């Protein structure tokens, strides 16, 4: 078939048997060698070349040989599985970046690989490194002119995904490299929203430390409101020690957060419900409009209005729960 030996070459590459590879290649014509190494191979659904799976599997030895003696294109693209998913438009450098194989990444950059290559999703190898969180690669990739500002097909910046996958030190890095903190995603989010919802205290600090705009996302939710709906009390108290938000905004977050302690399934604390809801009851000579009891839901109940109204519920494990659901419906729908 001739293409059957192509599979043997792909095998040794994927398996890192650089011995097996070398002995397969030598004594063949350039016509032959360009083919064998150019063969796109669909092991299952994943279409890739010998160079790629080696970088995808961190096999430096075979990668070095392929890049030098046989002189293979670094721009070869394919479609590689990562945690079940098939990503498309990926080069060997995109694979080694996400796969955490530094030595291969260096090699691949050393032999003239596009550090700014975009996948079909428009994911730079720097993004893959940011998703994975291997700071050495990010450092190296950036120090070799990987553009930090190119983003996802949905404008998900390298900074966001790292703020999402809690890569605190990678985040501080991108920030030191003056990554734009107030870049906004399609859904309207900033890296603050991502970090707040994910409860990454350290990252929220660095984000605010770099003059993070408190922007409103596509849902119309500040990172404060998001972090309270995701029931991330720690974050919510941090952000609230930076005025910026009104008195209305400060209360809504408190109530929301308190509500999210009774609606949340994982974290659930009716004591922490009667705390953020009692705090919310603000006074002076001015106050703050409830809704009708639902056709049957929520036990046909009305939210508390007086601070005295609320106090009487400190001890009703049940009614407090119901109160939280009512509060959520008000500030959500
Ligand atoms: O959702 C994602 C994550 C992708 C990814 C997938 C596997 C390993 C590294 C990175 S890279 C991207 O931009 N989009």
């Amino acid at each position: 078939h001739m293409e059957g030996l192509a599979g043997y070459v792909y095998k040794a590459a994927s398996e890192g048997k650089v011995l097996t590879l070398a002995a397969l290649l030598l004594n063949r014509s350039e016509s032959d060698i360009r083919y064998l190494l150019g063969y796109v191979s669909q092991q299952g659904g994943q279409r890739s070349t010998p160079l790629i799976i080696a970088a995808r599997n961190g096999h430096a030895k075979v990668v070095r040989l392929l890049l030098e003696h046989y002189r293979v294109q670094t721009q070869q693209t394919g479609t590689v599985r990562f945690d079940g998913y098939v990503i498309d438009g990926a080069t060997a450098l995109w694979c080694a970046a996400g796969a955490g194989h530094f030595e291969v990444v260096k090699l691949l950059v050393s032999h003239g690989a596009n550090v700014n290559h975009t996948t079909v999703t428009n994911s730079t190898p720097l993004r893959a490194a940011c998703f994975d969180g291997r700071l050495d690669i990010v450092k190296y990739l950036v120090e070799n002119n990987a553009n930090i500002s190119i983003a996802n097909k949905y404008d998900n910046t390298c900074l966001m995904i790292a703020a999402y996958k809690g890569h605190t030190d990678v985040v501080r890095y991108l920030l030191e490299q003056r990554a734009d903190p107030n870049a906004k995603a399609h859904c309207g989010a900033t890296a603050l929203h991502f970090a707040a919802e994910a409860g990454h205290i350290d990252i929220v600090k660095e984000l605010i430390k770099w003059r993070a705009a408190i922007v409103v996302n596509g849902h119309g939710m500040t990172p404060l409101k998001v972090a309270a709906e995701s029931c991330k009390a720690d974050v919510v108290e941090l952000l609230l020690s930076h005025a910026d938000c009104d008195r209305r905004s400060r209360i809504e977050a408190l109530e929301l957060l308190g509500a999210s302690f009774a609606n949340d399934r994982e974290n659930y604390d009716i004591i922490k419900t009667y705390h953020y809801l009692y705090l919310a009851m603000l006074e002076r000579f001015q106050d703050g409009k409830e809704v009708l009891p639902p056709i049957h839901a929520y036990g046909n109940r009305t939210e508390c209005r007086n601070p005295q109204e609320l106090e009487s519920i400190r001890q009703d494990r049940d009614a407090l729960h119901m109160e939280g659901l009512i509060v959520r419906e008000r500030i959500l729908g």
Side-chain angles (χ1 to χ4, degrees), residues 1-10 12-16 18-30 32-33 35-39 41 44-46 48-60 62-80 82 84-138 140-152 154-177 179-183 185-224 226-229 231-233 235-243 245 251-264 267-283 287-288 293-304 307 309-313 315-331 333:
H1 217 165
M2 176 51 169
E3 72 161 23
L5 307 82
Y8 278 84
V9 162
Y10 178 94
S14 53
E15 286 182 48
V18 69
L19 52 148
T20 321
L21 193 58
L24 280 165
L25 290 173
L26 170 49
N27 283 122
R28 305 215 171 276
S29 150
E30 168 56 21
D32 293 336
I33 289 149
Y35 169 59
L36 276 292
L37 300 185
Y39 188 103
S41 183
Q46 299 52 38
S48 47
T49 60
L51 173 62
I52 301 165
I53 37 68
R56 193 269 179 278
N57 296 345
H59 289 282
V62 9
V63 158
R64 160 158 269 263
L65 176 163
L66 285 175
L67 291 176
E68 278 161 10
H69 300 348
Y70 292 99
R71 290 163 175 103
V72 187
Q73 297 161 141
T74 76
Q75 68 255 16
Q76 270 170 14
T77 62
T79 47
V80 290
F82 271 87
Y85 292 76
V86 161
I87 180 56
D88 171 25
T91 56
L93 182 58
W94 191 91
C95 289
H101 305 135
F102 196 181
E103 199 202 327
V104 177
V105 174
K106 279 149 148 165
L107 250 167
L108 261 185
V109 163
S110 273
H111 284 70
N114 185 346
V115 307
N116 293 318
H117 177 69
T118 70
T119 68
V120 68
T121 328
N122 213 336
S123 163
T124 57
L126 180 78
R127 210 178 185 289
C130 278
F131 175 106
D132 180 55
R134 179 117 186 75
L135 186 126
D136 316 82
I137 286 143
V138 162
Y140 179 98
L141 270 196
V142 161
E143 281 169 13
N144 292 261
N145 307 140
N147 180 2
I148 294 176
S149 68
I150 164 162
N152 210 174
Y154 314 103
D155 299 334
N156 212 283
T157 77
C158 297
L159 182 69
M160 281 149 159
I161 192 62
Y164 186 38
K165 305 231 98 182
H167 297 317
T168 310
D169 54 337
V170 154
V171 158
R172 172 190 31 256
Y173 183 90
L174 306 177
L175 294 195
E176 299 174 2
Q177 307 314 317
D180 178 16
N182 315 296
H186 282 187
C187 50
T190 38
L192 244 194
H193 291 92
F194 286 71
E197 180 200 25
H200 295 339
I201 275 284
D202 286 337
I203 281 169
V204 180
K205 269 169 191 185
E206 287 277 1
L207 285 186
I208 271 288
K209 182 173 206 179
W210 294 66
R211 316 279 286 180
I214 312 296
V215 303
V216 86
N217 84 80
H219 271 98
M221 312 224 79
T222 68
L224 182 65
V226 162
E229 188 264 304
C231 188
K232 269 62 194 72
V235 164
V236 160
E237 275 167 0
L238 193 160
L239 286 199
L240 267 191
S241 92
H242 297 75
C245 67
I251 299 184
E252 154 163 329
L254 289 174
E255 318 215 281
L256 211 176
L257 176 77
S260 286
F261 277 104
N263 181 99
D264 189 319
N267 317 65
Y268 166 114
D269 196 355
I270 293 332
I271 276 176
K272 284 168 182 307
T273 310
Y274 185 100
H275 180 276
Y276 292 100
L277 294 199
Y278 203 42
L279 198 74
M281 296 289 180
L282 261 291
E283 75 127 290
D287 317 72
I295 285 304
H296 190 107
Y298 304 142
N300 237 32
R301 288 182 57 77
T302 311
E303 189 183 318
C304 299
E309 202 165 358
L310 200 276
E311 305 173 358
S312 62
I313 310 300
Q315 294 312 291
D316 190 337
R317 300 200 39 169
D318 297 304
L320 267 180
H321 189 126
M322 211 76 69
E323 183 71 356
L325 268 302
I326 294 160
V327 180
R328 181 169 286 238
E329 182 71 328
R330 161 155 75 74
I331 326 180

